[PDB]
Design a protein around this motif. Structure first.
Motif, PDB file in Angstrom:
ATOM      1  N   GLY A 130       6.215   9.596  11.588  1.00  0.00           N
ATOM      2  CA  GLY A 130       5.229   8.537  11.423  1.00  0.00           C
ATOM      3  C   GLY A 130       4.792   8.394   9.972  1.00  0.00           C
ATOM      4  N   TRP A 131       4.249   7.221   9.653  1.00  0.00           N
ATOM      5  CA  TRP A 131       3.671   6.929   8.346  1.00  0.00           C
ATOM      6  C   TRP A 131       2.161   6.795   8.496  1.00  0.00           C
ATOM      7  N   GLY A 132       1.428   7.280   7.504  1.00  0.00           N
ATOM      8  CA  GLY A 132      -0.005   7.077   7.438  1.00  0.00           C
ATOM      9  C   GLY A 132      -0.532   7.152   6.020  1.00  0.00           C
ATOM     10  N   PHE A 133      -1.779   6.748   5.843  1.00  0.00           N
ATOM     11  CA  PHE A 133      -2.406   6.813   4.539  1.00  0.00           C
ATOM     12  C   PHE A 133      -2.688   8.263   4.225  1.00  0.00           C
ATOM     13  N   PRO A 134      -2.610   8.649   2.960  1.00  0.00           N
ATOM     14  CA  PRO A 134      -2.967  10.018   2.576  1.00  0.00           C
ATOM     15  C   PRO A 134      -4.427  10.295   2.927  1.00  0.00           C
ATOM     16  N   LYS A 135      -4.703  11.361   3.671  1.00  0.00           N
ATOM     17  CA  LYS A 135      -6.062  11.664   4.109  1.00  0.00           C
ATOM     18  C   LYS A 135      -6.100  12.964   4.872  1.00  0.00           C
ATOM     19  N   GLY A 136      -7.309  13.461   5.126  1.00  0.00           N
ATOM     20  CA  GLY A 136      -7.505  14.636   5.946  1.00  0.00           C
ATOM     21  C   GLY A 136      -8.937  15.131   6.041  1.00  0.00           C
ATOM     22  N   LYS A 137      -9.075  16.326   6.604  1.00  0.00           N
ATOM     23  CA  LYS A 137     -10.370  16.885   6.962  1.00  0.00           C
ATOM     24  C   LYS A 137     -11.164  17.336   5.748  1.00  0.00           C
ATOM     25  N   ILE A 138     -12.422  16.916   5.702  1.00  0.00           N
ATOM     26  CA  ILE A 138     -13.350  17.296   4.630  1.00  0.00           C
ATOM     27  C   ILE A 138     -13.576  18.817   4.580  1.00  0.00           C
TER      28      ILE A 138
ATOM     29  N   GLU B 110       5.913   6.230  -0.298  1.00  0.00           N
ATOM     30  CA  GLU B 110       6.490   4.907  -0.494  1.00  0.00           C
ATOM     31  C   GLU B 110       5.489   3.783  -0.373  1.00  0.00           C
ATOM     32  N   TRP B 111       5.762   2.709  -1.105  1.00  0.00           N
ATOM     33  CA  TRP B 111       5.071   1.457  -0.920  1.00  0.00           C
ATOM     34  C   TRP B 111       5.639   0.754   0.290  1.00  0.00           C
TER      35      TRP B 111
ATOM     36  N   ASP C  55       4.850   1.247 -10.773  1.00  0.00           N
ATOM     37  CA  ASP C  55       5.662   2.271 -11.440  1.00  0.00           C
ATOM     38  C   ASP C  55       4.985   3.641 -11.479  1.00  0.00           C
ATOM     39  N   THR C  56       3.896   3.792 -10.729  1.00  0.00           N
ATOM     40  CA  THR C  56       3.299   5.096 -10.492  1.00  0.00           C
ATOM     41  C   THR C  56       4.375   6.014  -9.947  1.00  0.00           C
ATOM     42  N   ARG C  57       4.264   7.298 -10.263  1.00  0.00           N
ATOM     43  CA  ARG C  57       5.352   8.259 -10.092  1.00  0.00           C
ATOM     44  C   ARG C  57       5.606   8.631  -8.626  1.00  0.00           C
ATOM     45  N   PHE C  58       4.570   9.168  -7.983  1.00  0.00           N
ATOM     46  CA  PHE C  58       4.683   9.734  -6.640  1.00  0.00           C
ATOM     47  C   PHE C  58       5.840  10.719  -6.526  1.00  0.00           C
TER      48      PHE C  58
ATOM     49  N   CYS D 136       0.830  -1.211   0.000  1.00  0.00           N
ATOM     50  CA  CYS D 136       0.000   0.000   0.000  1.00  0.00           C
ATOM     51  C   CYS D 136       0.856   1.249   0.000  1.00  0.00           C
ATOM     52  N   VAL D 137       0.282   2.355  -0.459  1.00  0.00           N
ATOM     53  CA  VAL D 137       1.024   3.616  -0.499  1.00  0.00           C
ATOM     54  C   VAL D 137       0.864   4.342   0.838  1.00  0.00           C
ATOM     55  N   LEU D 138       1.981   4.592   1.510  1.00  0.00           N
ATOM     56  CA  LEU D 138       1.960   5.305   2.761  1.00  0.00           C
ATOM     57  C   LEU D 138       2.644   6.648   2.605  1.00  0.00           C
ATOM     58  N   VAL D 139       2.312   7.548   3.499  1.00  0.00           N
ATOM     59  CA  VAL D 139       2.875   8.870   3.405  1.00  0.00           C
ATOM     60  C   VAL D 139       3.492   9.285   4.747  1.00  0.00           C
ATOM     61  N   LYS D 140       4.335  10.299   4.708  1.00  0.00           N
ATOM     62  CA  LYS D 140       5.007  10.817   5.894  1.00  0.00           C
ATOM     63  C   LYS D 140       5.309  12.293   5.682  1.00  0.00           C
TER      64      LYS D 140
END
Length: 230
Positions: A119-127, A188-189, A179-182, A108-112
């Motif tokens: 910390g690492w987490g899934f891309p997300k946030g407040k509506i 990172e995966w 091979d998605t860019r990011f 899965c794609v994680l973000v930091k």
């Protein structure tokens, strides 16, 4: 105190007695103090009580406050506007995002971020204002990872839950090429097996709650991709 054999109703009664009935008697009718006690009791439930248990629903201040009121008669009676003013603004605000899986559904794609507790987490946030649940997930993903997941996000495929009283809904989107860019330092995966609780670990606390329902999704997905029906 003790640990956990309370059946929800039991817990509301305990919180009614420790936070409301306990108050100094001259403060027992104070609107500002009752609200301070309702919101302290909501934290105590989300941070501590739910820790010793797990099958209690996290609620956030709206619902928890109603359930308390109907459980504490003192709280019921004690000016209705200012109590709405208290729930309007102390709304913990819903989060939408995505868990992008790699095709095999092993990564899965994680973000930091650039912040100190990292910390690492899934891309997300407040509506946002006048924004759809789906729009928020697409926007947060594209702002954080630079991938436009518009053509493959599915409204029916998500893990929805409440955590510390904030509703979180992450759309699960499989089949994203390897091979998605990011602001964002790293994208990172990560291998789901390597993640804390799937099968150091402090790097991955924003992720762990979703591993159990995610893995359940994946199991179901692979069964459905391989069955015939009969």
């Amino acid at each position: 105190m003790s640990f956990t054999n309370a059946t929800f109703s039991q817990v509301l009664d305990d919180l009614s007695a420790r936070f409301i009935l306990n108050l100094p008697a001259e403060e027992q009718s104070s609107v500002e103090r009752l609200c301070f006690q309702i919101e302290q009791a909501h934290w105590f439930y989300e941070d501590f009580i739910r820790a010793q248990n797990d099958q209690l629903p996290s609620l956030g201040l709206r619902v928890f406050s109603a359930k308390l009121f109907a459980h504490c008669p003192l709280l019921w009676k004690w000016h209705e506007e200012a109590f709405d003013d208290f729930l309007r603004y102390k709304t913990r605000i819903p989060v939408r995002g995505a868990i992008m899986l790699d095709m095999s559904m092993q990564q899965c794609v994680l973000v930091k971020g650039w912040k100190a507790s990292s910390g690492w987490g899934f891309p997300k946030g407040k509506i946002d204002k006048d924004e759809s649940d789906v729009d928020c997930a697409i926007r947060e993903v594209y702002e954080e990872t630079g991938f436009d997941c518009s053509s493959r996000i599915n409204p029916n495929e998500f893990i929805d839950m409440t955590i510390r009283g904030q509703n979180v809904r992450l759309y699960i989107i499989p089949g994203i090429s390897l091979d998605t860019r990011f602001e964002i330092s790293k994208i990172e995966w990560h291998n789901l097996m390597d993640l804390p609780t799937f099968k150091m670990k402090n790097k991955f606390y924003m992720v762990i709650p979703f591993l159990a329902p995610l893995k359940k999704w994946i199991k179901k997905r692979n069964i459905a991709n391989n069955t015939t029906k009969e």
